Amino acid sequence: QEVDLTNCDREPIHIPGAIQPHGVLLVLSEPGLVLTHASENAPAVLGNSAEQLLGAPLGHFIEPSVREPLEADLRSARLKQLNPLKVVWRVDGVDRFFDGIAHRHQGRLILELEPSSHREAVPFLSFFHAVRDGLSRLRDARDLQELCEAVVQEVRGLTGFDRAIIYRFDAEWNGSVIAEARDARADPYLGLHFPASDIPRQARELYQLNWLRIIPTIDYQPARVRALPGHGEPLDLSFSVLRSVSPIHLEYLHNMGVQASMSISLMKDGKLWGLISCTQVSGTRYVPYEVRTACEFLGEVMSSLLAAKEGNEDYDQRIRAKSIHAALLERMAREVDFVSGLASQESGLLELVHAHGAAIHFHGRTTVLGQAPSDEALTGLIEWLGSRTGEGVFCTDRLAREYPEAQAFQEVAAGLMAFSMSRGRNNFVLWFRPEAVQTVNWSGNPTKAVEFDQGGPRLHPRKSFELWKETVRGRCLPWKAYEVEAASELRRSIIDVALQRSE
Amino acid sequence: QEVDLTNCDREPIHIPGAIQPHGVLLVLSEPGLVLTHASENAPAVLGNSAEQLLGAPLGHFIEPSVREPLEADLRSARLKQLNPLKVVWRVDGVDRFFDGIAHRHQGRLILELEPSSHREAVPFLSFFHAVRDGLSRLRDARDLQELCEAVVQEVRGLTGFDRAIIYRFDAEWNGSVIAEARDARADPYLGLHFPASDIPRQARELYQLNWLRIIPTIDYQPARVRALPGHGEPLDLSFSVLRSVSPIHLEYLHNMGVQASMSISLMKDGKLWGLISCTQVSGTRYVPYEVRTACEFLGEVMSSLLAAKEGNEDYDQRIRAKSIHAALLERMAREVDFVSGLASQESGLLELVHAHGAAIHFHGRTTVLGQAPSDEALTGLIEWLGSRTGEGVFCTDRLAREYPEAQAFQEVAAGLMAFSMSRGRNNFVLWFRPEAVQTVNWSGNPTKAVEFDQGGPRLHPRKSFELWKETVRGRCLPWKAYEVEAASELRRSIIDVALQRSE
Ligand SMILES: */C=C\C1=C(C)C(=O)N/C1=C\c1[nH]c(Cc2[nH]c(/C=C3\NC(=O)C(C=C)=C3C)c(C)c2CCC(=O)O)c(CCC(=O)O)c1C
Ligand SMILES: */C=C\C1=C(C)C(=O)N/C1=C\c1[nH]c(Cc2[nH]c(/C=C3\NC(=O)C(C=C)=C3C)c(C)c2CCC(=O)O)c(CCC(=O)O)c1C
């Protein structure tokens, strides 16, 4: 069982057959560098037709003195480190200048050409500071929030986007905007939640691999990528910066009121954690390659720091809940065994994991502490690790899926964590949590997040992003990481004590 | 009491009262920013005497334009982020430009000024690309050794040092060169071992707190930090980048044949793991502060990845170990005396941690498995285990280090593996490895590491660093971290079955 939901997760965005037409995509044979593919916008950008290019060697169109470094670079195994290449394209006698961005993927050498001449300046001083002072602000951040604020302020200052946010995925791949830097121009998304389908699963899978994408304007005609005969199979554009993006996302950006967009993957343990997401409300945003990779660099630094800076918000605790634990075990070894065990130190047991009641059961006698579910009628609870093979700390809040006799018997307080303690599943330590009922602020209605069109209706994005408060029924207060390993620490140190059973 | 605190370990290296004279140290009163200390080398570097600086407010000597931004930066609570400060020092006619490095320690505002030289788009972009490429090369490393190799290559490329090593500390705080990048003509230090007293414990503890240090030339006259009347106590220079270093380290570097140095602390679990150590054979290396902190950042990233990169190693052996664990667990449970379950897998139990001998002591009671009885005067190691902090898993390269009677048996250099089961000092399993008589290559004679070259009350170091081989007994071949984790996992499985129960 995965995720796995709607028809959003299936359009193949990585082979649209087309690019964003402000640059030119070529692919080159190896080792000859014969153009086997070329986007059809080549007349405007390069002054040659796609059919003038297909079949010719790259060096034909290149100014003679730049042929050697350019061709040596393109033969290199070190492509990513060499980008951007200086390409000087010569048609008739005219020299045009481009950033060349080359990569290899799925057996194809792809070369993308973004014009480098007549564009805006990129002040050196601001680039210099965003990189050097950005590195030092991120290193010196004391918690996740400070790390996020530094990123969005540096990336906004470096790019000039109207809005740069940190967008953090949750366990169900919905996200929320946890930091925002913005021109007063633009509406705050800070605090808003967005449904998982805004960034469907095949997009998340692409973005775990290609950590940057830019749409300098959502208003463009895709330029087809033409191929020589016998090179007509779909060209994998997974790692091409000009890849034309899914029209359903381009429609979504129109409905949101954004004209240009750029986002950078945030990674943790090889998994997509979130995005740095930049949007322009009015106007285009043709961010040059060098600026983009400075933003990618800040995103890699933040990524490398993600696990550290969030753990820092718990080092204050832990040692608290660690010396708590060392008192509960100080009081099972010198004292009873386990019986009136953590029961005499009950607000150490429930200050261990912040619950309103416990529930033990060495074939007891159970033993609440208190206002547990039903007390008497909870004998349908003490079996549940005997259903899924896990041994195993069951830790939930929405008991509306795994045992929703929180609906055919409700109760509320249905916020449970339970670990087991012996082999043939019998005895159980349960912590319950009362109901902290919460308003979650969504951007537009999350239940109508996908729309259906015709006529066997196709897929369209929602049209309103107006704030939409959801009163969430079912859920407790979140099991911050420690309620499991602090419970894991307790489970095993009590098996230790329990083994003086063999007194 | 363990290791170590001897005579080298006592020079107060944090209060030399003097700095390295290529930059100037100031300390500024708060909130008034009056100069209360200043290093006597001010005339060459700054253009005035300490006599003029002391008593005067910092804004006097600062360019009028950047006066207020500089003072605001220095009154900020958050100085680390702001470094390097742009200090435009004005003395009548000339502006002199400095990197300002400010910090607070022991209640003093310390500002250190290093002559800056100005940055150029080329090679800032090149430096930026190297740091970005360096960062992703660390995150991409496939195991520990290759993270080490990547670090020394990146750091040497960034700094231009003749040599950069990873120097790793062992249990007794001796060190070893485990990775090196160098100009090929320089002698390879790779493989050399060095005694703990080369980096004595007050240095090691300072370096646990201040992670970066550079000696741009070992030939310098320390400049005294003068002070106003009434601040004449020793100024704690723990965190100053210009702090004058211990004279016995300088002459060590002289005897080693190096002219400049720079090192980066490597931290793991809050303890000094090693150094990134950079050396120049001839000539100086005034590495700019920007380049230095980029190297320190790469060291911080390496430190964050040490455990993860080691966890990647021995991929197949881990799956093998997990197999034995299942087969071992399977038969304690299918069985009378669960202890006999593992006794019947000499093959299984010994391979789990790649040992040639094991002993299980439980409720009595020793049964020995491998060719490693140490004879059944065994009841000595077992019993000594019955002290200590028996949980979790105890492990040593060299059993003599913690248990000096271990010298008497050539069958258990290792070193164990492992652990106590039922907490009470009662019941253990032990694994043994044979001893691999090997040569350790020291650089210089480690028994004359503190040579008295005259030589009464003063301390002097080695004059010779020539390779000095030594045959070592009682060291077993290191335990892999996956073998420790297998030992801990089996321990939790044995205690599960032991609790459970009757039949
Ligand atoms: C089922 C179809 C889709 C519906 C319905 C929908 O809402 N999106 C669908 C498909 C889709 N989206 C994207 C790419 C994408 N989406 C986002 C979402 C956000 N942008 C914001 O500013 C915020 C919050 C403030 C959210 C949430 C983002 C960031 C992206 C990445 C591209 C970008 O940065 O603009 C794709 C993939 C598009 C492609 O790569 O071709 C698809 C198929
Ligand atoms: C007891 C006195 C000392 C003797 C004897 C000795 O040999 N050193 C003594 C004191 C001492 N050393 C240091 C700092 C230090 N030492 C090293 C050692 C090495 N440099 C190398 O290149 C290698 C291996 C190839 C080793 C081993 C290092 C790296 C350092 C850190 C300084 C630096 O990086 O150059 C101190 C503290 C010096 C200070 O900070 O003032 C002292 C007191």
Residue numbers in the entry:
A (entry chain A), B (entry chain B): 11 to 513
Paper text:
The SaBphP1 and other myxobacterial BphPs lack a conserved histidine (His) at position 289 in the GAF domain. SaBphP1 contains a threonine (Thr289) at this position, which is replaced by glycine in some myxobacterial BphPs. The mutant PCM also crystallizes in the dark in the Pr state in P3221 with three subunits denoted A, B and C in the asymmetric unit, but the PCM-wt crystallized in space group C2 with a single, dimeric BphP molecule in the asymmetric unit. Interestingly, the crystallization conditions for the PCM wild-type and T289H mutant are the same, yet they crystallize in different space groups. Indeed, the r.m.s.d. between the T289H mutant and wild-type PCM is ∼3 Å overall. As shown in Fig. 5(b) and Table 2, the PAS and GAF domains superimpose well, but the PHY domains occupy different positions. When this His is absent, as in the SaBphP1-PCM-wt, the formation and stabilization of the Pfr state is impeded. The resolution achieved with wild-type SaBphP1-PCM (2.25 Å) is the highest so far reached for unmodified PCM dimers. Hence, the SaBphP1-PCM crystals are perfectly suited to reach the near atomic resolution range (∼2.5 Å) in TR-SFX experiments.
Phytochromes are red-light photoreceptors found in various plants and microorganisms. S. aurantiaca contains two previously uncharacterized bacteriophytochromes (BphPs) denoted SaBphP1 and SaBphP2, which may be responsible for the light-stimulated growth of multicellular fruiting bodies. The classical BphPs switch between a red absorbing state denoted Pr (λmax ≃ 700 nm) and a far-red absorbing state denoted Pfr (λmax ≃ 750 nm).
